[PDB]
Every structure is written in C-alpha cells, then in structure tokens.
C-alpha cells in the first residue's frame, strides 16, 4: 500500500481536521442569514 | 435609532398648542379640521390616536405651524 498506509497517516490528519472546519462554516451561515433578516425587520421599522 | 424616533415623535404633544374642532374624516389618517381661528383647513394626523374618539366631532388640539391633529 503506497497510498493506503499514507491515506491513514498523512491524509487522515487533514480530512478529519477539515470536517469540523466544514461544520462551523455550515453552522454560522444558518446563524448569519438569521441575523440578516432580524436586521431587515428593524431597518424596515425605522425607515418607515 | 428606533428610540430616538420614538422620542422626537412623543414630544410633538408637549407644546402650547392651539385648540380646534374635528369636522370630517377623509380616509386613512387624513382629515378636515376646523380651528377656533376659523378658515377651515385640511391636514394629516398622527399615528398614535385611537380613531374611536372622533365620530362626528371632538374638541381637539392642533399644531402651530403644520396644524396637524395632536
């Protein structure tokens, strides 16, 4: 296993690390667009 | 900014206001009011007053310059 011993050694380090880095970017985008619409309500109040 | 909008609205009613009388209602938030100075007018009104106090007539308060219902 030229690649198989190393896919668990020097690639399993990276792809397990980018997993939680993918989760939080997924998590904040749901959090961000929620913050977007809450600001769009208050701007719709004050401008009116 | 929503509180400063509330503040500048809610101090339009603390002025030595003039007194008029409600005459007619046109539509949503715009009416005809006759003053105690005579010379019947046509102004816009506020967004605060509950509209169940103006049925044929009411002793009302008016602005000096813009002459709105207060």
């Amino acid at each position: 296993l030229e690649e198989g011993k190393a896919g668990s050694g020097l690639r399993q380090y990276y792809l397990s690390k980018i997993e939680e880095l993918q989760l939080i970017v997924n998590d904040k985008s749901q959090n961000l667009r929620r913050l977007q619409a809450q600001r769009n309500e208050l701007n719709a109040k004050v401008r009116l | 900014e929503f509180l400063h909008a509330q503040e500048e609205v809610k101090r339009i009613q603390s002025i030595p206001l003039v007194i008029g009388q409600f005459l007619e209602a046109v539509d949503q938030n715009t009416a005809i009011v006759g003053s105690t100075t005579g010379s019947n007018y046509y102004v816009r009104i506020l967004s605060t007053i509950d509209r169940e106090l103006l049925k044929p007539n009411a002793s009302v308060a008016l602005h000096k310059h813009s002459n709105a219902l207060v």
Partner: protein, 50 residues
C-alpha cells in the same frame, strides 16, 4: 364637479386633491350606520301586507 371641495396648497395656491364627502352637516340623523335590528320573520301575521 361643480360645488365640490378640493385641497388647496398654502404654498402657491395650487390644487392638490379633490376632496369627497361634500358639505352636509346634518346627515348625523340620516343613513344610520349600524343595523343589528330585528329580523324579517318575527313580524308574524301580516303576509298580505308584506
């Protein structure tokens, strides 16, 4: 319309809007707004007249 009120600007005496609900200070008594009055069938025995 002749004998109709309009909105006149105090700026330059320009016309602003045709004002409906013509001059009539005595239709308080006429055209009653609410009718939650009695019904049609409790008259009871005047069917030739009705």
């Amino acid at each position: 319309t002749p004998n109709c009120r309009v909105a006149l600007r105090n700026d330059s005496y320009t016309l602003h809007k045709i004002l409906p609900n013509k001059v009539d200070p005595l239709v308080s008594l006429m055209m009653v707004e609410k009718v939650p009055d009695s019904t049609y069938e409790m008259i009871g025995g005047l069917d030739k007249q009705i």
